[PDB]
RNA sequence: CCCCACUAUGCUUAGCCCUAAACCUCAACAGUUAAAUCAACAAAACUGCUCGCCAGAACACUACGAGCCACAGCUUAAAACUCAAA
C-alpha cells in the first residue's frame, strides 16, 4: 500500500521501571549493618516506605529481616547500634537541630 | 435623555463589528487601546484625575 | 531494660543550649511517632475504633498530598496576565 | 506524485526528535510580559521562561534562545477526574542565547 | 570539631571531658514526670543516691502539684542537696511526659546544675498491659 | 414558532420538519446550502459516554522502524550538543544523519544489528561528526 | 455520666452454646461498555443463567407446634382484634 504509514510495534523509546536502591539483592537477618540503615537512630523505630524510598517486595524483607534479627540476638530493639551511624544515610528523613 | 441610535439597518446587518457583544462601545474602546499597547512594543496628577 | 543506656532518645547539650535541645528531642519523638503512640495509650482504643482512626487518618493524607498536588500544578499560571486588555 | 500525510509526518523534525524529554531546542521570544519570556520552539505549546539575571537586557522580542526541553504539554489527572487537566504550555528550561 | 548531638559511646576512645569525668561517669538526674506530680533524683554512675525531690515533698499538695512551677520548686530543692554533694554536671533521663517535664530541668539549672545531655525514657508498651477505658466526658 | 429542542436531531432535520408541517412559514437562509452541501456527518447531540471492562479507544501509537535505531543512538551517544531548529522544516539532526548511513549501510547486504551500528558510527567519524560515547 | 477499690469475665485445657449493624447493608457463575446513561441516594449502566427470598403497616427477633448438650436459650414462625397509611 503506503511505505510511510506507521507500523505496529512496542515503544522503543521506552524507559526501564524504577528500581529500589535494595531491588536484585538478598537481605539477610545477619546484614545488620544494611538492616540499620532502616530504623531510626535515636529510636530504633523501622521507617516507613515512604522514607526509605523501598518498594513493596523489599520493604517486606527488610522489615521481616529487621524482626528477626531483633529477637535472635544480632539487632538491638530500642536504637540504632551506633557502630552503624556512619554508614551511607539513604532515608529521606532530617533529624537533627 | 440622549438616545443610542438604531444599532442596523433595513436590511439587519449590524454597523458595528462588536454588535453582538451587547458592548461595541466599551468593547471597540478596548479593543483600540490594546493594538495600540502592541505598537509601541513594536516600535519598542495633581491638576489631573 | 536490658539493652544500653543514654544512647536511645538522648540528645546532647550544645553550650548550655538546654531550650534548644529539649526542642531537638520533642522533635525527634515527634517525627518517630512516640509523643503521639504515648497519648493514643493513656486509655485504651478499642479494635473497631482504631481501625476507623487509621482509615480516616490514611485517607486524609491522600486527599490532602492530592490537593496539594493539584495546586502546585496549577499555580503555574498565577503569572501576570500576557493579554490584559483581551 | 502529492506528497501524503503519512510522509509529511515521517519526516517531520517534531517526529524525527523522538521523546521531548532533555532535547536541546532553539525557541524564539514573541511576547514579554515583564520578566516573563514567551518562547515558541515549532511545538504546540509555548513555553514560559523568567528572564534571567545575567544579561537580562539581551532577551528581547525576536531574540533566538537555547532551551531544554522537559515536556512538550503539561498535563495530570487528579483523583475523581475523567479527563486530564492541561495548563496549554510546555516545561522547558531556559540555557541561554544562541548566536551565530 | 563539629558538634554532635550523639552521646559519646562507652568503650570508644572520645576527646570529651567535663571537669575530667567521662560521659560515663557523670550524674544522673532522674526526673519522672507524672500528670499530677513531679520526682526528681540525682544518683552517681555508680548508681549512689545523692539527692531527692518532689513536688510533695515540697509542699505542695492536690493539684498543685501537678503545676510547672511546682516541679521548679522541687528541682532547685534536689540541685540544692546535690551541690552540696559535689555535684556540677548532670545527665537527664525525664520519663513521662507531665506538666513538670520541662520545669523540672529548668530549676536543676537555677540551682547550678550543668545539663550536659537530655534522654527521654517514657514507657512505650510494645503490644503490654491493656489501659483503663476511654473516659465519656 | 420553532424548536429549541437542540437534543432532538439536528438543526437541519428539525427545521426540514417543521417546513414540512408549515409551522415555519420560510425556510432559513442557510437552508439551501446545507441542502446542496451537506456535512460528512449530521450534527446531531450525542452523550460522551466512558468505556469500562474489555473496551479500549482505537487510537494506534505511531511508531516506524527507524524509531528502534532513534533509541539506541540516545542511549549509546546521548542526545546531541546541536539545537534542533523545528522552524526549518528540512531541519537534519545527528541522529538522523545517523539514521540515514544505518539504513544505507543495511541496504547493502549488511543484516546484523550489533555490527550494522558499529560500522555507522565510523563513516560519521570519517566525515568529521562528533560521537561523544555517553559512557 | 466523673473518681477509687474489687469480682464474674477477657487467657489456657476439654466440652458445650450457634447469636451479631455476622455489613462491600453489592447472592454465585458468565458476558457487554453499544444502546435509553440514569426515579433519588449509594457503589457507572446492563445482559444471560441458576439457586435463595419477598408480596401494606403493626401485632411479631411474638404465641402454638416441632427440633436442638441449648431449660430466663436458639432456629423455623402465624392468627385474631386495629389502622389508611407504614
Ligand atoms: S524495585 Fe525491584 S525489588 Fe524493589
Ligand atoms: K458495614
Ligand atoms: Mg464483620
Ligand atoms: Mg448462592
Ligand atoms: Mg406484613
Ligand atoms: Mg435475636
Ligand atoms: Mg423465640
Ligand atoms: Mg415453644
Known sequence: SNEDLPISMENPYKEPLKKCILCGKHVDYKNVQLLSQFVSPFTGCIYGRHITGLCGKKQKEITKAIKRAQIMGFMPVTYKDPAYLKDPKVCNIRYRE | PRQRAIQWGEDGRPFHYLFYTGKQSYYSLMHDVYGMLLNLEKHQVIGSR | AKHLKFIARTVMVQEGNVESAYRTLNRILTMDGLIEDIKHRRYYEKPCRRRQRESYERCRRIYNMEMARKINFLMRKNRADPWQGC | ?100 | TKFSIYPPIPGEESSLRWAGKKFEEIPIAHIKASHNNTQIQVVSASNEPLAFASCGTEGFRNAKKGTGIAAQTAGIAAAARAKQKGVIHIRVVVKGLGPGRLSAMHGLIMGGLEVISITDNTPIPHXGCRPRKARKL | AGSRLETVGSIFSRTRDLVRAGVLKEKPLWFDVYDAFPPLREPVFQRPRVRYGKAKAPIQDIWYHEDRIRAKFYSVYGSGQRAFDLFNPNFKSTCQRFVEKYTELQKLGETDEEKLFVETGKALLAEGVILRRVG
Request: glycine share 8%; proline share 3%; with cysteine.
Open chain 4, 1 to 100: 506524485n502529492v506528497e501524503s500525510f503519512a510522509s509529511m509526518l515521517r519526516h517531520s523534525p517534531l517526529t524525527q526528535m523522538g521523546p521531548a524529554k532533555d532535547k536541546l531546542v532553539i525557541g524564539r521570544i514573541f511576547h514579554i510580559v515583564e520578566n516573563d519570556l514567551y518562547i515558541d520552539f515549532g511545538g504546540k505549546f509555548h513555553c514560559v521562561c523568567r528572564r534571567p539575571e545575567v544579561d537580562g537586557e539581551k532577551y528581547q522580542k525576536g531574540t533566538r534562545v537555547r532551551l531544554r526541553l522537559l515536556d512538550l504539554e503539561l498535563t495530570s489527572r487528579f483523583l475523581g477526574a475523567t479527563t486530564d487537566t492541561t495548563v496549554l504550555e510546555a516545561n522547558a528550561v531556559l540555557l541561554g542565547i544562541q548566536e551565530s
